[PDB]
Amino acid sequence: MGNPWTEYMAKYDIEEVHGSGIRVDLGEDAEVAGTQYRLPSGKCPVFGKGIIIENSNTAFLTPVATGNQYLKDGGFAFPPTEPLMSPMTLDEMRHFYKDNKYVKNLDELTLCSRHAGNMIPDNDKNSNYKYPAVYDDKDKKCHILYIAAQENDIGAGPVASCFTTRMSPPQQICLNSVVNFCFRPAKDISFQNYAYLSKNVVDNWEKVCPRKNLQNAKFGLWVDGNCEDIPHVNEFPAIDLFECNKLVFELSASDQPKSHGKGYNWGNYNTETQKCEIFNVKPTCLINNAAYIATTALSHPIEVE
């Protein structure tokens, strides 16, 4: 008795390896100056996730609107600071943290998450509040998100104008201007190179988190020596894998006002019938079926292993 798949399938136990929402990650609370704020806390990167702002062509990685000029407009990212903390290229990150012996042998995504986590909302220097970030794998650039909300208590953090570094010797960094609208998370083709990163992304995410989809494989449940099919699935039409991953993402665990990672996080994509079969039970084995690709809401929407 027992399940021979246990070790290989640990990557797909979303409740354990990720532990928070996927579509909307607001799995923790942090105090800043006596006030509690929700913020993202998932331990895995979410590949291909971005935010779409309604009634706008403004990209969500545009810095948040500052000042009070007519037509002021912006996105979710940190505005300019002195010195400039965001966006920061991978090379800039490696050089500015060159004196921190612990950043060596951090991978690109982890380094971005830790850079974002360096800034403390200045009102509470003992605060556990850490901003999320988006890493652009194309331009190799890290964007700190000033607004942690993802759909619209909704994750809008403190209205901080000044920040202190967790890294010593401490530096204080303030915004160069004052900070001053419906939106939703999504996997868009234009987001395919992005990774959405909470403060909790683990150093070894490459080994414990799902990234690529599994070809010629179908998620199943281990039942007395056989890999049975998932008992209850929701079937949708999907012209290709990207559309199926987009759908799984839309239905996945969401903390929008805590999921703790529970939701419709997995999909079996039938490349022959062009059907996406989405379910909300953790899979415990894989079925050898040439027509299928197995995907999760966390996974890159296109890449296969």
Author numbering: 6 to 157, 174 to 201, 211 to 287, 293 to 340
How is this structure described in the published paper?
The malaria merozoite protein apical membrane antigen 1 (AMA1) is critical for RBC invasion and is one of the most promising blood-stage vaccine candidates. AMA1 binds to RON2 through a surface exposed loop (RON2L) to anchor the parasite to the host cell membrane prior to internalization into a parasitophorous vacuole. Here, three single-component AMA1-RON2L immunogens were designed that retain the structure of the two-component AMA1-RON2L complex: one structure-based design (SBD1) and two insertion fusions. We determined the X-ray crystal structures of SBD1 and insertion fusion immunogens 2 and 3 to resolutions of 1.80 Å, 1.85 Å, and 2.10 Å, respectively.
Additionally, we created insertion fusion immunogens by inserting RON2L into an AMA1 loop proximal to the RON2L binding site. Insertion fusion immunogens 2 and 3 were constructed by replacing several amino acids in the DIf loop of AMA1 with RON2L and a flanking Gly/Ser linker. Immunogen 2 lacks amino acids 260-PRYCNKDESKRNS-272 of the DIf loop, including Cys263, consequently disrupting a disulfide bridge. The disordered DII loop was replaced with a Gly/Ser linker in both of these insertion fusion immunogens to prevent the potential displacement of the fused RON2L. In contrast, insertion fusion immunogens 2 and 3 retained the RON2L binding mode of the complex but displayed local distortions in loops near the vicinity of the insertion sites, resulting in Cα RMSDs of 0.381 over 232 C-alpha residues and 0.309 Å over 228 C-alpha residues, respectively. However, the IC50 values elicited by the insertion fusion immunogens 2 and 3 were 1.5-2-fold higher (i.e., less potent), and they were significantly different from that of the AMA1 DI-DII-RON2L complex (P < 0.005). Similar to AMA1 alone, the insertion fusion immunogens 2 and 3 produced potent strain-specific responses but were ineffective in inducing a broad immune response, possibly due to the insertion of RON2L in the DIf loop. This insertion results in a loss of strain-transcending functional activity, suggesting that either the local structural perturbations introduced by the insertion fusion disrupt strain-transcending epitopes or epitopes within the DIf loop contribute to protection breadth.
